[PDB]
Design an enzyme around this catalytic site. Structure first.
Site, PDB file in Angstrom:
ATOM      1  N   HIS A  30       3.867  10.768   6.867  1.00  0.00           N
ATOM      2  CA  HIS A  30       3.490  10.355   8.208  1.00  0.00           C
ATOM      3  C   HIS A  30       4.664   9.746   8.925  1.00  0.00           C
ATOM      4  O   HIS A  30       5.163   8.701   8.519  1.00  0.00           O
ATOM      5  CB  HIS A  30       2.373   9.334   8.135  1.00  0.00           C
ATOM      6  N   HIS A  56       1.644   9.112   1.624  1.00  0.00           N
ATOM      7  CA  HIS A  56       0.477   8.883   0.773  1.00  0.00           C
ATOM      8  C   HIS A  56       0.554   9.891  -0.349  1.00  0.00           C
ATOM      9  O   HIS A  56       0.922  11.036  -0.109  1.00  0.00           O
ATOM     10  CB  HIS A  56      -0.824   9.078   1.558  1.00  0.00           C
ATOM     11  N   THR A  80      -5.060   5.615   9.436  1.00  0.00           N
ATOM     12  CA  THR A  80      -5.813   5.892   8.206  1.00  0.00           C
ATOM     13  C   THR A  80      -5.854   4.712   7.242  1.00  0.00           C
ATOM     14  O   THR A  80      -6.489   4.821   6.199  1.00  0.00           O
ATOM     15  CB  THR A  80      -5.268   7.109   7.447  1.00  0.00           C
ATOM     16  N   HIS A 122       0.811  -1.220   0.000  1.00  0.00           N
ATOM     17  CA  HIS A 122       0.000   0.000   0.000  1.00  0.00           C
ATOM     18  C   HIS A 122       0.846   1.272   0.000  1.00  0.00           C
ATOM     19  O   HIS A 122       0.467   2.256  -0.636  1.00  0.00           O
ATOM     20  CB  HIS A 122      -1.039   0.006   1.129  1.00  0.00           C
ATOM     21  N   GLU A 132      -3.998  13.088   2.713  1.00  0.00           N
ATOM     22  CA  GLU A 132      -5.113  12.504   3.452  1.00  0.00           C
ATOM     23  C   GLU A 132      -5.840  13.606   4.198  1.00  0.00           C
ATOM     24  O   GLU A 132      -7.022  13.844   3.977  1.00  0.00           O
ATOM     25  CB  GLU A 132      -4.577  11.441   4.399  1.00  0.00           C
ATOM     26  N   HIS A 171       6.214   6.888   6.290  1.00  0.00           N
ATOM     27  CA  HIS A 171       5.767   6.560   4.958  1.00  0.00           C
ATOM     28  C   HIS A 171       5.034   7.767   4.421  1.00  0.00           C
ATOM     29  O   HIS A 171       4.866   8.785   5.128  1.00  0.00           O
ATOM     30  CB  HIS A 171       4.822   5.376   5.003  1.00  0.00           C
TER      31      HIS A 171
HETATM   32  C1  LIG Z   1      -0.288  -4.091  16.099  1.00  0.00           C
HETATM   33  C2  LIG Z   1      -0.130  -3.993  14.821  1.00  0.00           C
HETATM   34  C3  LIG Z   1      -1.215  -3.480  14.111  1.00  0.00           C
HETATM   35  C4  LIG Z   1      -1.108  -3.258  12.742  1.00  0.00           C
HETATM   36  C5  LIG Z   1       0.085  -3.546  12.072  1.00  0.00           C
HETATM   37  S1  LIG Z   1       0.166  -3.287  10.506  1.00  0.00           S
HETATM   38  O1  LIG Z   1       1.510  -3.195  10.016  1.00  0.00           O
HETATM   39  O2  LIG Z   1      -0.529  -4.312   9.787  1.00  0.00           O
HETATM   40  N1  LIG Z   1      -0.677  -1.955  10.228  1.00  0.00           N
HETATM   41  C6  LIG Z   1      -0.227  -0.720  10.462  1.00  0.00           C
HETATM   42  O3  LIG Z   1       0.896  -0.499  10.857  1.00  0.00           O
HETATM   43  N2  LIG Z   1      -1.125   0.228  10.188  1.00  0.00           N
HETATM   44  C7  LIG Z   1      -0.944   1.581  10.092  1.00  0.00           C
HETATM   45  C8  LIG Z   1      -2.067   2.221   9.597  1.00  0.00           C
HETATM   46  C9  LIG Z   1      -2.071   3.586   9.419  1.00  0.00           C
HETATM   47  C10 LIG Z   1      -0.964   4.352   9.716  1.00  0.00           C
HETATM   48  S2  LIG Z   1      -1.128   5.944   9.421  1.00  0.00           S
HETATM   49  N3  LIG Z   1      -1.454   6.074   7.856  1.00  0.00           N
HETATM   50  O4  LIG Z   1      -2.251   6.453  10.150  1.00  0.00           O
HETATM   51  O5  LIG Z   1       0.084   6.636   9.765  1.00  0.00           O
HETATM   52  N4  LIG Z   1       0.160   3.720  10.200  1.00  0.00           N
HETATM   53  C11 LIG Z   1       0.190   2.363  10.389  1.00  0.00           C
HETATM   54  C12 LIG Z   1       1.169  -4.061  12.780  1.00  0.00           C
HETATM   55  C13 LIG Z   1       1.056  -4.284  14.153  1.00  0.00           C
HETATM   56 ZN   LIG Z   2      -0.137   7.143   6.756  1.00  0.00          ZN
END
Ligand SMILES: Cc1ccc(S(=O)(=O)NC(=O)Nc2ccc(S(N)(=O)=O)nc2)cc1
Ligand SMILES: [Zn+2]
EC number: 4.2.1.1
Length: 257
Positions: free
Chosen positions: A116, A93, A195, A61, A103, A91
């Site tokens: 982010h 977007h 997000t 993604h 976003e 990362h």
């Molecule tokens: C506990 C755990 C939960 C989720 C993951 S993950 O790698 O599958 N997902 C994740 O890190 N999601 C995530 C989503 C959104 C953002 S954001 N776009 O808000 O910065 N950062 C990270 C890993 C460990």
């Molecule tokens: Zn993000």
């Protein structure tokens, strides 16, 4: 199998992740005239001098630059935050076109991209526990506009060819995330969520007022990445952004007049 396509995009996520329609979802539109200056907000403390970057990963993604978060090496403190939040990854977007990609929006304006920097609250011991807490994460959001190049971004841009497809990673040591920061740390802040799925409502959002400028060549290289794995049909990694979600019962606070 969530993603950003017509059949698995943000409007579908609620079927697997019902919290998608929750009370504190992100991103949001930042209505600058309605955000209230909060004099009690402390200055933000961004301490990245001892950052240890390790690796860069295409996760299907976006791409993550990951850091060693097993000690207080790169931390965010102050602002709206209580305690110490450790940098784990950053990362971006971005869009298929310069007129979209962020976003968060500002008075409904979309930027070309959004950075982010993801941090977790050390009182919870690790990232997995932190995401289960309402004050578990702090994400520092920085808008990107297309103009002059950002010299500090180029090392990221130049490794992207080596992680073109989902599941590819590459060594990425000694990268200094201070080179991605704007001059001013004036910010807006509100309680929100991840997000992307799992969309957990564990994030204190700190979104900087001042965007950074990146070159058209820099963002074009973002758009050459692939959502797909090697040997699968090519689908360009573009428009990997969630649109603005309802603000509901939240006030956005500003650190500045
Ligand atoms: C506990 C755990 C939960 C989720 C993951 S993950 O790698 O599958 N997902 C994740 O890190 N999601 C995530 C989503 C959104 C953002 S954001 N776009 O808000 O910065 N950062 C990270 C890993 C460990
Ligand atoms: Zn993000």
């Amino acid at each position: 199998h969530w993603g950003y396509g017509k059949h698995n995009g943000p409007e579908h996520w609620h079927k697997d992740f019902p919290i998608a329609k929750g009370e504190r979802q992100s991103p949001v539109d930042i209505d600058t005239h309605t955000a209230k200056y909060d004099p009690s907000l402390k200055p933000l403390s961004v301490s990245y001098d001892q950052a240890t970057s390790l690796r860069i990963l295409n996760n299907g993604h976006a791409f993550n630059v990951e850091f060693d978060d097993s000690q207080d090496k790169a931390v965010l403190k102050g602002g709206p935050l209580d305690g110490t939040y450790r940098l784990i990854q950053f990362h971006f977007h971005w869009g298929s076109l310069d007129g979209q990609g962020s976003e968060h929006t500002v008075d409904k304006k979309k930027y070309a991209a959004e950075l982010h920097l993801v941090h977790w609250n050390t009182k919870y011991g690790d990232f997995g526990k932190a995401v289960q807490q309402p004050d578990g994460l702090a994400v520092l959001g920085i808008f990107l506009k297309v103009g002059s190049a950002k010299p500090g971004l180029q090392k990221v841009v130049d490794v992207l060819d080596s992680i073109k497809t989902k599941g590819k990673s590459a060594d990425f040591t000694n990268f200094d995330p201070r080179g991605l920061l704007p001059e001013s740390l004036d910010y807006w802040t509100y309680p929100g969520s991840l997000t992307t799925p799992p969309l957990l409502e564990c994030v204190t959002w700190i979104v900087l007022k001042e965007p950074i400028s990146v070159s058209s060549e820099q963002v074009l290289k973002f758009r050459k990445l692939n959502f797909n794995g090697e040997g699968e049909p090519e689908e360009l990694m573009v428009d990997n952004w969630r649109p603005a979600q309802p603000l509901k019962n939240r006030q956005i606070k500003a650190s500045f007049k």
